[PDB]
Amino acid sequence: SWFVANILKEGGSGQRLSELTDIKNDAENRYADVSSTFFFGKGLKSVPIRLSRSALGTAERRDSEVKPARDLADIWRVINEAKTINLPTFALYNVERSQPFNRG
Amino acid sequence: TCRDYIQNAFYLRRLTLKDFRRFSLLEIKFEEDLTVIIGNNGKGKTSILYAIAKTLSWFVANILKEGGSGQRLSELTDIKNDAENRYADVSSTFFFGKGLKSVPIRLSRSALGTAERRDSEVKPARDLADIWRVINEAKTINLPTFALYNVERSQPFNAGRREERFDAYSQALGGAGRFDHFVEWYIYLHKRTTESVQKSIVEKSICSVVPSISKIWVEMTTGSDLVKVTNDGHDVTIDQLSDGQRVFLSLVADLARRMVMLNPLLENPLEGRGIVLIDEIELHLHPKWQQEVILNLRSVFPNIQFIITTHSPIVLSTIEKRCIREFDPNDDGNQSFLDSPDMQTKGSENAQILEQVMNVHPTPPGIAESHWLGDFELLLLDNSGELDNQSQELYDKIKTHFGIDSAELKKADSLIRINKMKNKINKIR
RNA sequence: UAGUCGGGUGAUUAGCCAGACUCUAACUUAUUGAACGUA
DNA sequence: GGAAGCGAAAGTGTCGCAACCCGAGAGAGGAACGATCTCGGGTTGCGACACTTTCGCAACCTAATACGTTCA
C-alpha cells in the first residue's frame, strides 16, 4: 500500500497495521513488525520496508521504515511523468471478493 | 491587548483561481460591504462561492477544533480537465483589522501521478483561526459567522446539538441552512423564557427583513408545540407560508440564529462580522421584494460582508456599481478579471440597468407590436417629419392596441407634434 | 538450470577460462573514530 | 524529536428509505348501511454513508571541516 500511495503522490501514505487486532496478545513486546525486502534488479537488489505498529495504550511508538518504498515509487512516478512507462500492478483478492452483483 | 484586537474589520479581499473548474486564471477583488456577481446563471458563480466556502471551511475547522483540517479540494472535480499545469490552486487573501492586513490562504490539489504534491498552504489562516479559538476559550469573544446559501435552501419544512454554542458552525457552509435546527432552537428558547433578548432579536430580524411576516411566536399546545407567524394578518404555521416567503424566512432565521450564538457579547448580535455567500438572492421573490432585499439585509446586519449573485435589474438598482462584477458573455475566452459595469446602477432606472448591464431590451423583440412605436419614429422621419398613410395606419394600430392613455400613444403624439413644429419652423426660417 | 566466487583478455560493459552450491547476500557513512596511503 | 499537511483507522451520528399502522372517504350491490380499495399523517427500524477523532508519516539541522581512499 505504501508503494501504491507513493506512486499516486509523492509524500503519500499507505495502509497501517492495527493497534487492536494486529499484535499478538501473548506478546511481551506489545508491538508488531512486518519487515520485508523487495528486489528490482541488479541496481536496486534490496528494497527494505518495515510496517511496524505498537499496541494501543503503550507509551512507546514504533516508527515504520517506508522510506526506501518512497524512493522507488518516486522513481516510478517521476520517470512516468517525464516520459510514459509501465507501472507495477498491486492487487489483493481476499475472501471479500465474494459479494452480490448489486445494481473517478 | 483588547482581546488581541478582535473585540478592525474582518473580511475577504481577493480570490485567485488557477486551473480550477474552467477558471484558467481568474482573480476577483471583493468589497468589504457587499459584492455582487452577474453574467452567469450560477455555473461559474457557484464555483466562486464554492471556492470561497472551501476556504472558509478551514477557518471553521480550526476555530472549532485544534489542528482541524477543513474541507480540501477534490482531485476529480476541482481541477480544470485541460490544464498543462495538472494542478488547481484556489488562493485567497483576507483582511482582519489594522494588524494582520493580509492573511493569505491557498487550497491546492494536483492530479494523481504528479511529481510534486501540490499542497495547500493554510498555515496563516490556521494560525488566525487558532488565535480566535484560544482567545475565545480564555475569554468569550464574538466570532465570525460564515454561511453559504445556494438554490438548495428551497427545501420543504436534541438540546445538546442545538442549544450549545459553536453549533452555529454546524452545516453553516455547504448550502441550505438548517432551518429545522432553528425551529427546534426557537421552541427551546421559548421553553426557557439571556435567551429572552436572543428571541427578541430574531423576532425583530425576521419581522423587519421579511415584508409579509409581521409577528412570530409559538403555541405550546399540550402534545404539539407549533411555530406561528402573522402572514398578511393571517395567523398561520410555517407549513402554510409560500415558497418564497418561507425560503427567505429560513435563510434569514438561520443566519440570525448563527449570529446570535456566535455573537453573545454584542448589544445587537446581528451586527457581528462574517462572510455570507448567497446564490440568487432573488429566488422566489417578486419585484417589490427584490427592490428591498439588500436594503433590509444591510440594515439588519450592519457589519457583515455579503457575496451574493443575482440576475435581476431591480436588485442591481439598489447596489453601487463598484460592488458589481460582470462575467462576459464570451467567458470561453477565460478572463483574468471581473470589471464593474461602466454605467451606474444604484438609484437608476431598472429599465436602463436591464438594457445596458444585462443587454435586455425594454420591450421584447418577439412581439411585433413591441417594435411598432419605434417603427413609427423612423416612418415619421422618412416623410420629412410629416404623416403619410403608413404612419397614420401605424398610429391607429398603436391607439387600438395599447389604448388611448397608452404611454406609447402619448409618446407617438409627442413625436408627431415635435416633427410638425420642426417643419413649421423650417418653413418660417 | 540458476545464483554465486573472481584468473586472465578488453576498457566499470562485453567476453574466454576455471571452479565450488548449510532452504539461505543485500557492497553500506564523513569532516568524527580507527586502518591505508600520501606527504 | 518531530513542523505542515495529508490521509488511514476507527468510532459515532444523520438521515433517506422502507415498513407498517390508523383514521378517513366514496360509496359495493344488492336489502339499510355501506366490503373493499384507496388517500393521507405519522411512527419506528435500519443500515449506508458522513462527520469526528487520533496517529503517524518525516521537513529542519549559533556551535564542523574542508589531501585522497576504505569502514562503522
Curated annotation (Swiss-Prot), chain A:
Highest taxon in the source lineage: Bacteria
Entry function: Probable ATPase component of antiviral defense system retron Ec78, composed of a non-coding RNA (ncRNA), a reverse transcriptase (RT), this protein and a putative HNH endonuclease. Expression of retron Ec78 confers protection against bacteriophage T5. At multiplicity of infection (MOI) of 0.02 cultures slow growth when infected with T5 but do not collapse, at MOI 2 cultures enter growth stasis.
Name under which the protein is recorded: Retron Ec78 probable ATPase
Source organism of this protein record: Escherichia coli
Curated annotation (Swiss-Prot), chain B:
Chain location of the short sequence motif ATP-binding per the record: 39-46
A GO biological process held by the record: DNA synthesis involved in DNA repair
Domain of life according to the entry: Bacteria
Coiled-coil annotated residue ranges, if any: none
A Pfam match: AAA_21
Keyword tags: Antiviral defense, ATP-binding, Nucleotide-binding
Example GO molecular function: ATP binding
Annotated function: Probable ATPase component of antiviral defense system retron Ec78, composed of a non-coding RNA (ncRNA), a reverse transcriptase (RT), this protein and a putative HNH endonuclease. Expression of retron Ec78 confers protection against bacteriophage T5. At multiplicity of infection (MOI) of 0.02 cultures slow growth when infected with T5 but do not collapse, at MOI 2 cultures enter growth stasis.
NCBIfam families: PtuA
Name of protein: Retron Ec78 probable ATPase
